[PDB]
Write a structure and sequence with these properties.
The structure is cut from a larger assembly and holds chains A, B, C and D. By secondary structure, chain A is of the alpha+beta class. Chain A has helices at about 15-20, 40-45; strands spanning about 20-25, 30-35. Chain A has a two-stranded antiparallel ribbon. Chain B is an alpha+beta fold. Chain B is about 50% helix and about 15% strand. Chain B is flat. Chain B starts with a helix and ends with a helix. By secondary structure, chain D is of the alpha+beta class. The longest helix of chain D is centred in the N-terminal third of the chain and has 16 residues, at about 20-35. Chain D is elongated, with a radius of gyration of 21 Å. Classes of the chains: A alpha+beta, B alpha+beta, C alpha+beta, D alpha+beta. Chains in contact: B-C, B-D, C-D. At the B-C interface, helix 1 and helix 2 of B face helix 2 and helix 4 of C. Bound molecules: zinc ion. Zinc ion binds near residues 61 and 91 of chain B. Zinc ion binds next to loops of chain B. Chain B binds one RNA strand through helix 2, helix 3, strand 1, strand 2 and strand 3. Chain C: It is found in: Nucleus, Nucleolus. Chain C: This is Ribonuclease P protein subunit p29. Chain C: Component of ribonuclease P, a ribonucleoprotein complex that generates mature tRNA molecules by cleaving their 5'-ends.
Amino acid sequence: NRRQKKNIWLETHIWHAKRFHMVKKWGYCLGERPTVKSHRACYRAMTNRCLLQDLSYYCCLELK
Amino acid sequence: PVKDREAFQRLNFLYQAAHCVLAQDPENQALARFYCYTERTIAKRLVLRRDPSVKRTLCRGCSSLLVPGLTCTQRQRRCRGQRWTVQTCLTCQRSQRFLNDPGHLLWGDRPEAQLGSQADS
Amino acid sequence: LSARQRRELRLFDIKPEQQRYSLFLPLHELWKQYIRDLCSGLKPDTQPQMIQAKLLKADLHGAIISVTKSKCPSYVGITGILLQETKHIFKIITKEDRLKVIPKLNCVFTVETDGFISYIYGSKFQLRSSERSAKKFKAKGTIDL
Amino acid sequence: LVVKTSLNNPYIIRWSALESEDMHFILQTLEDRLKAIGLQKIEDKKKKNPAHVRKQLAIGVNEVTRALERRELLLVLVCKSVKPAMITSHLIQLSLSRSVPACQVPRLSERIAPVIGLKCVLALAFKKNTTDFVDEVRAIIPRVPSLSVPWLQDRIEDSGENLETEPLESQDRELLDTSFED
RNA sequence: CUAGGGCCAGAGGCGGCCCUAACAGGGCUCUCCCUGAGCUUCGGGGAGGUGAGUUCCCAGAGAACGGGGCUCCGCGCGAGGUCAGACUGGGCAGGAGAUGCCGUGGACCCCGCCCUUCGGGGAGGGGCCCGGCGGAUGCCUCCUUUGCCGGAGCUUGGAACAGACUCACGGCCAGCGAAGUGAGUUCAAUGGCUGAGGUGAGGUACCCCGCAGGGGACCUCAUAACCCAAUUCAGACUACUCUCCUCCGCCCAUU
Ligand SMILES: [Zn+2]
């Protein structure tokens, strides 16, 4: 909580920072590259297999 | 015992060179101070059994072996009880107490006069 | 204590440079008589490794040196008695008042004895030279000059 | 057999020669020149009801040392009080620059005893720069035997070292102190 | 199998802050110790709190406690004279040092202002110790002396409110046999040749412009070493010098 006073520290941000490269950016610190070499493996999982992302930066305007 | 007897010549050679510097030129003491610092460094690393009166006149504050006699202050006073000789060098502003008194002359001869007497070959 | 001892300095200034170098002449006589009383053997010939042991184990403070080969040519051709000694340099005084700081990095010194001449490669001779007479002098490395 | 070598270097600075007769009559001459002038000094100090007070008679170790430090042409009289006298009068030996440190071993208390003063003065000196006290004392000053100190340089370009490696035995101090710990 | 978790005991958590979970990581600031050719407000290395244990011989009173060694002092005990200020009377101590001046010295005591109301922190004043300078009287009012006890002090030795080393502030508990690493091999592949440009340099009989000159063009030399991946990444280490940004030192020559 004391560190989260400065940064954002999402719920899955600690799961990402456990095994992915997290670089500070224009908004919060997010995942740039994986720690393991999987540049061909990400495409091979993108074509036939399964792959997911973490998209939490999308702010929402609800209009009533 | 031979190799220590060798380094004895080097130590009292540095000690005599410090006296040569302090008797040669006044008020510029850097050679004698460096020689006394080297002499104290040798005795600090290769630790030996040195003489008690000479080493306490080396003034272990930084380095001054002949300097407090003719340049800096050595006087006498009476602080509380027995009279004390105050030895103060004008380099690091440290003091040395040495009590000198007639009733304790045997304790003045207790470390010193024995080694003169009990010296056997 | 060390930073409190580093207030004034323990090193030379401009004022001891003009001390009329003939006053430093009895230091050479002191060193020469110390070599005469240390070795105490001259006439037939005897044991150059005894000479190497005396030149390794003794403090060279206050001795006559002359740079005979060095990597800098301007350092070569400098004689004089030495006054200080530091980690990788040492300071000498020469003729008419000026002093020089000679580094022990890659150089060799001719030392003139009473009747001998000794070359000393000042490469391994370093690191607070009281450590030289103490311990740790092994056989490593050659110096090409 | 526990015997350890110790580098002890008391290069022995011996005192002046024991010239009994010469010192014996010049000290009586000093007593005559002190009694010949008078006692205005004790009458000005104690005030028992100023010209003789103007001498700077350094009495005690500290006054003699502050007289011998700066730059002063004067005369010092030193007596041996106890056996620890080399440490105190080593200042007087070392301060030979422009002064005369005359040392008398048995006789200096017999100088202070008839002179009207106080308790027996151990170290004495007198600063008498440019004022006329007694010219005969200033004639006696280059006549006393001077002390040559080979400890520092002895003013001549010549150095001599001596080797004194004392074997300290544990058995000697063991039998003199007689102490044991377990 | 969310180990941003739980279990017995503990109530201790490695100078402080900030970032990360790659917490044997990095940066800043404060102190201590050691060393260094730039006077030093400089740089490098190591350490920071608490509790326990230890530290050749000799010396010294004590290397952790106490006693045995000496010196100085008495809101305590005891003895004698009692002759208790008589010309400021008597006794002790004092040139072997009583006292006077000075204070960005002390882990000491008391008063005392500010933040604050646990340990407290900071400007000041009084006593003792400490250092510097110059020297004559200070104590008590019935007096004197030793003995026990209490407090303080001591020259040594590499060491004496110390420093150095070691241990301790927790332990235990969680795997997936199925495709194929912007190189993925394992009886162990991958920096091969040529030419022009990059950079460090030299020379010019080339071209354009008119400030003696500047810019481009042509030719040659040098572009190395350390070493080699088998799962990856973060950080620290050690081995570098074709190469770039700074702080520098010494020596030589000039104005
Ligand atoms: Zn000192």
